[PDB]
Amino acid sequence: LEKLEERRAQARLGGREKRLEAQHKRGKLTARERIELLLDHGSFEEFDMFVQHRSTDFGMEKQKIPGDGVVTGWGTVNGRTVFLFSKDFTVFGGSSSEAHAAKIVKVQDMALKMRAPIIGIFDAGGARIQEGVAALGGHGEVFRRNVAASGVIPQISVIMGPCAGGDVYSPAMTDFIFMVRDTSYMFVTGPDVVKTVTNEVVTAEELGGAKVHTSKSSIADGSFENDVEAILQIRRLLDFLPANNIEGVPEIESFDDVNRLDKSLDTLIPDNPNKPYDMGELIRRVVDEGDFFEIQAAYARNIITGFGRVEGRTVGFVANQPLVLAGVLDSDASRKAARFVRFCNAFSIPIVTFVDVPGFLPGTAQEYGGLIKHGAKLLFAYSQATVPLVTIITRKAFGGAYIVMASKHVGADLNYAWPTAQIAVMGAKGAVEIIFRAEIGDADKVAERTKEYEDRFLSPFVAAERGYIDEVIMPHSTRKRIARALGMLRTKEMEQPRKKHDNIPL
Amino acid sequence: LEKLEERRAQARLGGREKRLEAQHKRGKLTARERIELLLDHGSFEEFDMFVQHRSTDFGMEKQKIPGDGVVTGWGTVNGRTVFLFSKDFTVFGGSSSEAHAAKIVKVQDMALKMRAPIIGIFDAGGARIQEGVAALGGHGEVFRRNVAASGVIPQISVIMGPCAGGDVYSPAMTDFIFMVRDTSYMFVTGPDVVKTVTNEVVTAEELGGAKVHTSKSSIADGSFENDVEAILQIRRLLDFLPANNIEGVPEIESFDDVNRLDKSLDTLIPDNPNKPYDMGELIRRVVDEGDFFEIQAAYARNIITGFGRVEGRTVGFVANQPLVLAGVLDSDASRKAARFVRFCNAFSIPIVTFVDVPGFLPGTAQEYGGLIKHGAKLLFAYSQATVPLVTIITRKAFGGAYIVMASKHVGADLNYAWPTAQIAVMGAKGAVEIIFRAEIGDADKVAERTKEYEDRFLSPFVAAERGYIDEVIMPHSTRKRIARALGMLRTKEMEQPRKKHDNIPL
Amino acid sequence: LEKLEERRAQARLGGREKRLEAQHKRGKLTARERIELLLDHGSFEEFDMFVQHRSTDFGMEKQKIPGDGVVTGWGTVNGRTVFLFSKDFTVFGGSSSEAHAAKIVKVQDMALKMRAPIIGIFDAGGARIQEGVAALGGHGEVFRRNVAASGVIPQISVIMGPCAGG
Amino acid sequence: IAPEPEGPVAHRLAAVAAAIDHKLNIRKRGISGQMRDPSLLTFQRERVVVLSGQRFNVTVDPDGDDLLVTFDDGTTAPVRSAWRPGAPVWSGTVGDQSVAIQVRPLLNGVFLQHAGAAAEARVFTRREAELADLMPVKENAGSGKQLLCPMPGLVKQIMVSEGQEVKNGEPLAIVEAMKMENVLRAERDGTISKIAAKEGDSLAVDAVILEF
Amino acid sequence: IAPEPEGPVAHRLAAVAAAIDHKLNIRKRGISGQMRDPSLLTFQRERVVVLSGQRFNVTVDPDGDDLLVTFDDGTTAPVRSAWRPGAPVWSGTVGDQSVAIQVRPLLNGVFLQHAGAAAEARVFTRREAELADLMPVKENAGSGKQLLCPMPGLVKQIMVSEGQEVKNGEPLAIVEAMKMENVLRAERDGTISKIAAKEGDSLAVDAVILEF
Ligand SMILES: CC(C)(COP(=O)(O)OP(=O)(O)OC[C@H]1O[C@@H](n2cnc3c(N)ncnc32)[C@H](O)[C@@H]1OP(=O)(O)O)[C@@H](O)C(=O)NCCC(=O)NCCS
Ligand SMILES: CC(C)(COP(=O)(O)OP(=O)(O)OC[C@H]1O[C@@H](n2cnc3c(N)ncnc32)[C@H](O)[C@@H]1OP(=O)(O)O)[C@@H](O)C(=O)NCCC(=O)NCCS
Ligand SMILES: CC(C)(COP(=O)(O)OP(=O)(O)OC[C@H]1O[C@@H](n2cnc3c(N)ncnc32)[C@H](O)[C@@H]1OP(=O)(O)O)[C@@H](O)C(=O)NCCC(=O)NCCS
Ligand SMILES: *C(=O)CCCC[C@@H]1SC[C@@H]2NC(=O)N[C@@H]21
Ligand SMILES: *C(=O)CCCC[C@@H]1SC[C@@H]2NC(=O)N[C@@H]21
């Protein structure tokens, strides 16, 4: 029937040609263009194309656009099943109505039932004001399904436009949030209400723009230049992730060699203890082909999280970054690493940790901000993990920070150390000041005590003698040791005690 | 044998008579006195009384004190088995050594195996500097057992002295932290290092005192005047809590009547919508005998969490407080309520929620602080819970805040509303300004439309017609309806999908 | 660093050259030679090479030998993961101390966690007399691991020397 | 300041506190989940009643439904009442004399008012009383002579005048924020020295409103 | 500024980019867990190569080990190399001429340098190229001609002077915080007007060090 094709073409128009032209003039793709770019060619099957809202308040009965402002369906990304929904900004500003939320709920239920990833593309305005509390009920159903799917299937949210009001809480409960720079923003309350209440004049970009949520608020996991780059990076990320919490990490044929040595790593650690180095260089020289998908790269840059591949299999990486804040652990880095470790453990992704940390960040700002619980979050995530854990200490591991950074005491499977590792309670000077507090009023005796303590304890060998370090390895064999360790540890079987859930501090 | 009794008496002295006298001169009890006060008379059995350290560094071999700075064992509180450890401040400043941590690990393992609560009493210094990385390893073992026991047995930490360095992370992962005012403090980094690094001068009290951790940092769940009051309140809390995640809430004979009506509640809600009221009064008139154990009373006072009894059984309560910040939801209140709800769900404690919330707190400070994820924490906790959930709307429930506050859309079992409830997307003025944005310049028309919207939608009846509210009830029947609902819901059986754990935002 | 390689070479000597020569004169291989012969070429990864005892009784503090009389680790046999430990007869007669038993317990826990076979090579004397009831406690921990792994992973014991007492 | 109980009033208050503590302990000992049978246990009859810095060594003996309280000097004060927890007024007979005591629960005790006298009542065992005697008497630091505004908002009303003496727990000003009023109350005692803000003024946090 | 490719250099760079994209796609199509066998799919031969705002409509045809790249104007250029991802240099023959090309990682593409010319190379399908054409060209903002200190600390060394020309990526000063140095680098191009901070001074967050 030509009438069916005509109705399909009418439904594909969304709001109208003028709305789509405005969307393109903003530099943004349409919802259907985004879906087409995300999925494999010809793989998209659309659900609920002709769904219409049933509201009769405020003259809504005269505006019935098929689809109700969201395009839902499923397809394949690199041949693997994915479910997705893309909000159509041209239809009532992408606002969520009862039928809109019903379509989203259908796609969420299908994704959870089929144990496949679900992708959310957000370019909307929130609950539709004309529909009243029905929109809120639909939002609540979507939230309930987001919580049900958490830790079962990977959930990815892509913010490619406005996201305000109750709309933001659905991406917040997903695993990863990505934003498009200069065209997307997220906030619970809009600039107008902020002005009316707090008398503060702020634009949408200054309130919830990509930079704010990628570098300050810990909300977004990354930002991209435009829609095309963001969607291509989403496709790239999907190739790293397991489809669910059962199938395990995907495998590809690796062009790299697991037995290659990296002689340049033998000179990575500077002789001067005060001289920093780039840990990202070590990570990118360890992973296959130097390919690393970094997570939250712009936020809490004293730590590094991201996905690489070792021998063709996805591996999570956590590493202190000495280039930023001397690589100390603060609240922001602790929360970032904790969430990343929790995700990796929930989906059976092994974690490799590179440790160079002198301790925690001091000050009243950290203590008043809850650094105790925030650091306990990372400690809890590491101690809870049952995936393989391989830890490499490069230069420093002091005290509680050493304990937290996936030490053997919290359940690490293999703990290696470079010859430059320094595993101690604290620095030599402070340890001497505490132990020899009675003779702190000297100049040569204090120096002799400090030198003796440095020679005895500022090394990896006290830990090695206690068995806390499995082996002191040469830096050039790091990748080979990691690959062999992960290959052996693939069969790890461990279980936490039976519980409804843990009580990790929030 | 008289020699055995003499050795026991010598071990009971801890550090020395002078150090015990100095402890008493600070207004603090000794560790053994605190254990005696906590437990039922004659019920304490002590483990590892004669354990001593094996360190030979820095002359430690000449200081071998039995117990190694901690008293461990088990007893009964009101006839119910509890395990406990109390750090002895007179022995090396309470610092944690290898044998010290081994004793703590033994008591933790016993508590987990027996499915009994474990109480930690902290008056210490952290890791013992003279022992090196062995103390860190012991701390790590303690942390691992804290994480393993999370959500299985209730873990209570009582801070009755200094708690510095790596010591603070064990209480941080427990369920509840209580502090003694003017004599206890917690911080990751001490004042001396803070002065050295950040150049600011702070005392121990200013950095980590009881007030800071009860009102600013979200660390402590409460503070008490002295040791005796704190320990008695710990006994009371233990009477409130289940022994493990299997046995359910304890039951006592109630002196109150579940069928009594409270006529005073019919006048609790002021006629003026801008006038607040005390929600704590409603909570204390609903619980048995007006007995309410509030949790985190000094922190995020726009929300209320705590334990009460209905018909002699423990019930958790969450309620917006209109007296503070108009009862809005912000990051602090969201995190507090989320942690409380997670604890209640983990241990099969039903939750009653009183809702009067106009929305979320606006401003750049909230958005930059991550209000999206912090509110998502409470939404996640409510949507995840499988314990009975009873919600009562008193005055206001607007938008996303209405969704989050245990609405039927996120899994609430019974949702009641008072006649003064107002369930809507937003206020009438803003809704009219959005719906009728084209004609905002006509004052009389705007007023007429605002009045019409207020009549139509600022009521509980639109939600009642959609089935979102089970029944609009009289305020004087609130306790009777709650008691009957909980009695019916005791047999609730539901489960989240199979997973290692969720990925709740941190 | 050449110092790390020197420390490894010193740890590989066990008791001393004279003890190893006496071991070879009995027709017996060393513990490391036995491990090398058992595993696929180049597959052995050693745990706790530098572990030493912490005893201070009867002058034991003057005899700190890396490894504490046992070589532990994992490898492959015909490409399949196996865990193993070989007691070094040259180090205190192969006797089991606290750190010795801790290394054995580590390898047993790894074998059980990874669901892989564990091979025990015994050339020893029993519990180290100088390390009191701590040696007995370590033996008990090893026994508990043996019982826990029974019927889950295959456990093979090879007696290549004295095996007495506990 | 309400006077502390003296003589027979103090004895009656101590007897009432002991009876309430006995009733609460008897109910508490019936909790479920105990390791062994609660009946296979003994109750320490000797108690110490601390009554606003005043100690009474008493013995509680249940003579059937009622309770018998015996003091150090040998006097016995039987206690008979039908009071239940949560009831604001304790009504009954203490030593063949009907009495009415206001009961306001507090932490680990009760606040009692009777015959014009008020006192905080706590009941310990002898060991618990001895341990509680080791606790220090902490003094409140008070508050400064400035009334800072705890929240930003618009001042709607001021119920105090210039040079007016106020007591603790008395309203001082009303501040409205986010369409909700907030009644500010005096935390100390002192005449108002100056009023810095009036109606219609928008104030931020930690802003001076009135000075004591 | 490195010149953009033109003529045969541009053609060789486009052919190499197409070959690298083809190799990466062939490896990518072998991922495990696909819904059905990846052999039951088809590769879109038509491709678009964008060399820094320069389009090339090309077709990639697998012919044995080497790859055959055919351009719009009939010309074909076989590509043969043993290059593997992660190798910094692409070595092989394009057409019948040996060539060495630097390959650098890029988001959704590769940065290529050859014969004195450099360009960012992205390979799309025709539909993907059409969609990418809709994306706007965004202009960077820059810095406010001041070197704000990103962290508090003590200034250790300043390697610039007033009235001296600095380019982008040139170090400007070293600031040491918590026993760790931090090398500050210029984010723009210009001359340093004046130097405010001096070696040994302790700065704070958002402190002026020098002006451009
Ligand atoms: C999401 C938001 C930031 C979008 O930014 P914006 O483009 O500058 O705002 P717009 O008015 O142009 O939104 C586009 C359309 O979608 C509509 N819309 C947006 N959000 C909506 C919602 N939650 N419900 C119903 N309609 C909505 C708008 O009415 C508008 O309609 P119009 O083009 O015919 O005039 C903003 O619209 C918003 O916050 N919406 C939530 C509801 C609200 O509070 N609106 C007033 C604040 S401006
Ligand atoms: C916990 C702490 C705040 C206690 O406050 P304090 O009473 O004012 O400090 P004190 O020196 O008096 O501690 C009491 C004793 O316990 C010892 N002690 C405290 N913490 C210790 C530790 N982690 N390891 C070993 N010994 C420790 C102290 O050396 C001291 O010994 P002393 O009485 O013979 O002089 C503080 O001691 C501390 O931070 N300890 C951790 C280690 C440290 O950094 N010390 C230097 C900071 S003051
Ligand atoms: C196991 C055993 C049969 C080995 O046979 P052996 O070679 O003829 O006995 P050795 O004395 O030569 O043992 C070799 C060394 O290991 C030591 N050793 C052996 N078993 C030990 C143990 N359980 N604890 C500590 N040291 C031990 C021996 O002291 C001896 O030391 P040395 O060479 O410096 O003299 C025998 O040593 C034994 O039974 N040891 C257990 C302890 C014991 O009972 N010893 C006395 C019986 S001989
Ligand atoms: C000297 O400058 C101070 C050295 C001790 C403090 C440093 S700051 C970062 C590390 N974290 C911590 O707690 N101490 C270390
Ligand atoms: C008028 O004064 C402003 C009313 C709308 C803002 C108020 S502030 C607290 C509530 N939260 C929110 O987002 N809006 C409400």
Q: How many CB atoms lie within 10 A of CB B481?
A: 17
Q: Which ligand is nearest to the CA of A126?
A: 1
**Whether B465 contacts B410, CB under 8 Å:** no
Which is nearest to B87 in space by CA: B176, B163, B179, B183?
B163
Q: Enter the DSSP assignment of B210.
A: H
User: Looking at the complex, does the CB of residue E34 fall below 8 Å from at least one CB of chain A?
Assistant: yes
Contact A243 E33 (CB under 8 A): yes
d(CA A95, CA B188): 46
**Whether B30 contacts D134, CB under 8 Å:** no
Chain B residues inside the 8 Å CB shell of A343: 503
> Which tokens go with B181?
């005012």
d(CA B276, CA B272): 9
Contact B80 D31 (CB under 8 A): yes
Q: Which amino acid is at B22?
A: A
Instruction: Please identify, by atom number, the ligand 3 atom nearest to the C-alpha of residue C163.
Output: 1
> Which tokens go with B5?
């009794």
From the CA of D36, how many Å to the nearest CA of chain B?
7
Distance of alpha carbon A466 from its chain centroid, rounded? 35
> Which tokens go with A331?
């609240």
Strands (E), D3-95: 46-51, 55-63, 66-70, 76-81, 89-94
Q: For tokens 């002991």, what's the residue?
A: D18
**Whether E202 contacts E153, CB under 8 Å:** yes
d(CA A410, CA A352): 14
Q: H helices of B319-359, where?
A: 331-346
Which is nearest to D90 in space by CA: D23, D4, D7, D6?
D23
**Whether B120 contacts B170, CB under 8 Å:** yes
Strands (E), B42-116: 45-47, 70-77, 80-87
φ, ψ (nearest 5 deg) of residue B488: -70, -40
From the CA of A364, how many Å to the nearest CA of chain B?
6
Q: Quick one: angle between helices B31-38 and D126-133, nearest 10? A: 140
Residue of A16, A25, A95, A160 best suited for mutating to test ligand 1, as the one with most atoms within 8 Å of CB: A95
d(CA A227, CA E132): 9
d(CA E56, CA E119): 13
Q: Which residues are registered as beta bridge partners of B307?
A: B293, B316
**Whether A210 contacts A180, CB under 8 Å:** yes
Which is nearest to A68 in space by CA: A84, A48, A83, A82?
A48
d(CA C99, CA C88): 14
Q: Enter the DSSP assignment of B59.
A: T
From the CA of E21, how many Å to the nearest CA of chain A?
14
The DSSP code sequence of B23-42 is HHHTT---HHHHHHHHSPTT
Chain C residues inside the 8 Å CB shell of B54: 54
Burial of residue C54 (number of CB atoms within 10 Å: 0-12, 13-18, 19+): buried
Pocket of ligand 3 (CB under 6 A): C 92-93, 95, 125-129, 162, 164-165
User: Looking at the complex, does the CB of residue E25 fall below 8 Å from at least one CB of chain A?
Assistant: no
Q: Which chains sit next to D, with 3 or more Cβ pairs under 8 A?
A: A, B
Is residue B502 helix, strand or coil?
A: coil
Contact D181 B276 (CB under 8 A): yes
> Which tokens go with D78?
């039987």
d(CA A404, CA D117): 58
Q: Quick one: angle between helices B443-457 and B428-435, nearest 10? A: 120
For this PDB entry, the determination method is cryo-EM
Q: Which ligand is nearest to the CA of A55?
A: 1
Which is nearest to B20 in space by CA: B120, B90, B67, B121?
B90
Strand order in the sheet with B70-77: B45-47, B70-77, B80-87, B118-122, B155-159, B176-180, B222-224
Mark whether A400 is an active-site residue: yes
Q: Is B411 annotated as a binding residue?
A: no
Is residue A70 helix, strand or coil?
A: strand
A95 lines ligand 1 (CB under 6 A): yes
Distance B278 CA to ligand 5 centre (A): 20
> Which tokens go with B374?
């912090």
Chain B residues inside the 8 Å CB shell of D180: 274-276, 322, 326-327, 358
Chains A and E touch (3+ CB pairs under 8 A): yes
Q: Which amino acid is at D168?
A: N
> Which tokens go with E140?
């960077």
Start-to-end Cα distance in chain D? 22
Is residue A18 helix, strand or coil?
A: helix
B94 lines ligand 2 (CB under 6 A): no
Q: For tokens 């004049």, what's the residue?
A: A201
Q: Which residue lies with its CA nearest to atom 27 of ligand 3?
A: C93
Q: Quick one: angle between helices A227-240 and A31-38, nearest 10? A: 40
Burial of residue A70 (number of CB atoms within 10 Å: 0-12, 13-18, 19+): buried
Residue A406 Cα distances to A425, B104, C46, angstroms: 16, 21, 21
Q: How many CB atoms lie within 10 A of CB A40?
A: 15
> Which tokens go with E163?
């009235």
From the CA of E178, how many Å to the nearest CA of chain B?
7
Q: Going by C-beta distance under 8 Å and a sequence separation of 6 or more, which residues neighbour residue A214?
A: A179, A220, A222, A223, A296, A298, A299
φ, ψ (nearest 5 deg) of residue A111: -60, -45
Helix (H) or strand (E) segment spanning residue E122: strand E117-124
Helix (H) or strand (E) segment spanning residue B377: helix B371-384
Distance A194 CA to ligand 5 centre (A): 9
Which is nearest to B369 in space by CA: A368, D126, C162, A115?
A368
Q: Which residue lies with its CA nearest to atom 4 of ligand 4?
A: E178
Q: For tokens 């117990």, what's the residue?
A: B67
Chain B residues inside the 8 Å CB shell of A377: 506
Q: Which chains sit next to E, with 3 or more Cβ pairs under 8 A?
A: A, B
Q: For tokens 């496949």, what's the residue?
A: A116
Q: How many CB atoms lie within 10 A of CB B253?
A: 11
Q: Is C137 annotated as a binding residue?
A: no
Q: How many CB atoms lie within 10 A of CB A364?
A: 18
Which is nearest to A147 in space by CA: B404, B173, B463?
B404
Q: Going by C-beta distance under 8 Å and a sequence separation of 6 or more, which residues neighbour residue B488?
A: none
* Chain A / chain E CB contacts < 8 angstroms: 111
Is residue E29 helix, strand or coil?
A: coil
Which is nearest to A177 in space by CA: A129, A122, A127?
A122
φ, ψ (nearest 5 deg) of residue D5: -65, 145
User: Looking at the complex, does the CB of residue B257 fall below 8 Å from at least one CB of chain D?
Assistant: no
Q: For tokens 């019930």, what's the residue?
A: B315
Helix (H) or strand (E) segment spanning residue C81: strand C80-87
Is residue C166 helix, strand or coil?
A: coil
The DSSP code sequence of A105-141 is HHHHHHHHHHT--EEEEE-S-SB-GGGTHHHHHHHHH
d(CA C96, CA C94): 7
Burial of residue E37 (number of CB atoms within 10 Å: 0-12, 13-18, 19+): exposed
Strands D146-148 and B162-164 turn out to be unpaired
> Which tokens go with B255?
């002196």
Contact C50 A494 (CB under 8 A): no
Mark whether B73 is an active-site residue: no
Nearest CA in chain E to A21: E134
> Which tokens go with A255?
């062009």
Nominal resolution (angstroms): 2.0
Distance A214 CA to ligand 5 centre (A): 27
Q: H helices of E37-166, where?
A: 126-133
Residue of B320, B328, B330, B450 best suited for mutating to test ligand 5, as the one with most atoms within 8 Å of CB: B328
User: Looking at the complex, does the CB of residue E178 fall below 8 Å from at least one CB of chain B?
Assistant: yes
Residue D121: left (phi > 0), alpha (psi -120 to 50), or beta?
A: beta
φ, ψ (nearest 5 deg) of residue B80: -110, 135
Strands B118-122 and B70-77 turn out to be unpaired
Q: Which ligand is nearest to the CA of B15?
A: 2
Q: Which amino acid is at A422?
A: Q
Mark whether A280 is an active-site residue: no
Burial of residue A73 (number of CB atoms within 10 Å: 0-12, 13-18, 19+): buried
Q: Going by C-beta distance under 8 Å and a sequence separation of 6 or more, which residues neighbour residue B62?
A: none
Chains A and C touch (3+ CB pairs under 8 A): yes
Q: Enter the DSSP assignment of C127.
A: B
Q: Is C11 annotated as a binding residue?
A: no
φ, ψ (nearest 5 deg) of residue B453: -65, -40
Q: Going by C-beta distance under 8 Å and a sequence separation of 6 or more, which residues neighbour residue A271?
A: none
Is residue A329 helix, strand or coil?
A: strand
Q: Going by C-beta distance under 8 Å and a sequence separation of 6 or more, which residues neighbour residue C146?
A: C108, C155
Is residue E181 helix, strand or coil?
A: strand
From the CA of E145, how many Å to the nearest CA of chain B?
27
Q: For tokens 């912000």, what's the residue?
A: B330
Q: For tokens 């045969």, what's the residue?
A: E8
> Which tokens go with A233?
């990076």
φ, ψ (nearest 5 deg) of residue B353: -120, 125
Strands E180-185 and D55-63 turn out to be unpaired
B242 lines ligand 2 (CB under 6 A): no
Helix (H) or strand (E) segment spanning residue D37: none
Q: Going by C-beta distance under 8 Å and a sequence separation of 6 or more, which residues neighbour residue B72?
A: B46, B47, B48, B84, B85, B86, B103, B104, B106, B107
d(CA A140, CA A169): 10
Q: Which residues are registered as beta bridge partners of E34?
A: none
Chain A residues inside the 8 Å CB shell of B386: 500
**B163-174: buried (b, 16+ CB within 10 Å) or exposed (e) per residue?**
bbbbbbbbbbbb
φ, ψ (nearest 5 deg) of residue D19: -65, -45
A321 lines ligand 1 (CB under 6 A): no
d(CA B307, CA B406): 17
Start-to-end Cα distance in chain B? 57
Instruction: Please identify, by atom number, the ligand 1 atom nearest to the C-alpha of residue A128.
Output: 24
> Which tokens go with A204?
């949408």
φ, ψ (nearest 5 deg) of residue A479: -65, -40
Q: Going by C-beta distance under 8 Å and a sequence separation of 6 or more, which residues neighbour residue A98?
A: A53, A54, A55, A131, A134, A135, A137, A138
d(CA B434, CA B449): 12
Of A413, A470, A492, the CB nearest to C48: A470
Q: Which residues are registered as beta bridge partners of B296?
A: none
**Whether A169 contacts A143, CB under 8 Å:** yes
Which is nearest to B354 in space by CA: B388, B312, B408, B396?
B396
